């Protein structure tokens, strides 16, 4: 039995071409849109986007006054540590970690990000990687604070290596975040935690994904196959 | 009326769930109609199958087995369900439309019942071909077989086109599909064969949809991965 499934869209096409199709498009079954947008588009997208099921995500912001003015403007959402943050930017553990606690503490819904890189999967290192990639964030939350939060998986190792995710690998690495959180937090917040996955997802690919046990959900970019992802999840 | 339904849950390895913990859970649910269960196994599994499944309307089969030595160790064994011809015996062991009949001719030969399943993939079903593949993966058991040994045999329809490549089967899909196969063996075999014959879908079923599938005139149950939903499906079979 599974909680909501979450459609979440990473702008990095047409914003404008792509919010109409969105618009226009029939989504008949439960499940939450998320399309998250950078500074720069966030007042088209709000302006836009007229589907009642999807709501708009800001990025990455990790200021309390700012937090604080995206929403009063009507942004409840924030998606946190994606991988180029992590590789690129250098967000540590710990700045994702107090990100993910000052969107909470501002009545914020959380998309916090995680993933391991090849040269960690290679080693043997995901668990270690991704668990205290975790332990960090946990370590900042109450026990009520895990309502407003839900996990993407980013199997970094595979976006741009030549390495390709199995539905099988997707499902493992999906496990392992819902174990700890059964054993650290708790079975009931463990059994109510949406973990999206932010991988390679397109329609050949997003129902076998999404039928596996433990995953929830997409976190991926914005494109026109969005739509199919959506479909996926029933 | 429809004939007794089948509800039969099918081991593949490497699966997130623990066979014994699966095996617990079905040892302790009611189940108040009449409706054969099966469960099918791997062969090292097997025994600890035998030990712990022990709830009434539940029975244990075993899989692609094809010696006739074998065939007769597992009956002895307790073991009189079997399944073959699942779709990766066809894809990646190279087991043919003959090789499967044969399977089926000698699990029958040693007093079996027999679940073989048949279908067809998505190139086949993107150009048209459904019917002759369907009918020929059919009429090579048909050719094994002596009329009276249809009544060990059940047909399990696999969507093949539809697991793993984003297409979806609808009831109306199903319902298509299995008129066929009764047509077919109707036509081929006897309008009495045809009537008393289960048909199973294993295609991708769960909760949500167990009931709109189990309600086409020619569907009788379901050939379906082990699963704790597989609870769920049994319940859709009324």
């Not at 969107?103 to 205290?132: H, K, W």
């Not at 690495?173 to 949406?194: F, P, Q, T, Y």
């Amino acid at each position: 039995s599974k909680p909501q499934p979450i459609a979440a869209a990473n702008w990095k096409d047409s914003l404008s071409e792509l919010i109409d199709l969105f618009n226009s498009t029939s989504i008949n079954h439960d499940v939450q849109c998320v399309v998250a947008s950078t500074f720069v588009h966030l007042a088209m997208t709000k302006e836009r986007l007229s589907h009642p099921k999807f709501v708009i995500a800001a990025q990455n912001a990790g200021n309390e006054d700012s937090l604080p003015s995206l929403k009063d403007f009507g942004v409840n959402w924030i998606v946190l540590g994606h991988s180029e943050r992590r590789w690129y930017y250098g967000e540590t553990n710990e700045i994702v970690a107090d990100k993910v606690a000052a969107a909470v503490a501002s009545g914020f819904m959380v998309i916090a990000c995680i993933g391991e890189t090849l040269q960690e999967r290679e080693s043997g290192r995901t668990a270690v990687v991704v668990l205290t990639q975790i332990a960090a964030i946990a370590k900042k939350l109450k026990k009520a604070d895990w309502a407003k939060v839900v996990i993407a998986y980013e199997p970094v190792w595979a976006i741009g290596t030549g390495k390709v995710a199995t539905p099988q690998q997707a499902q493992e690495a999906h496990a392992l975040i819902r174990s700890w959180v059964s054993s650290k937090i708790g079975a009931d917040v463990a059994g109510e935690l949406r973990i999206l996955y932010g991988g390679s997802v397109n329609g050949k690919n997003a129902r076998t994904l999404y039928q596996q046990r433990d995953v929830n959900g997409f976190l991926v970019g914005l494109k026109p196959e969005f739509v199919d992802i959506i479909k996926a999840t029933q």
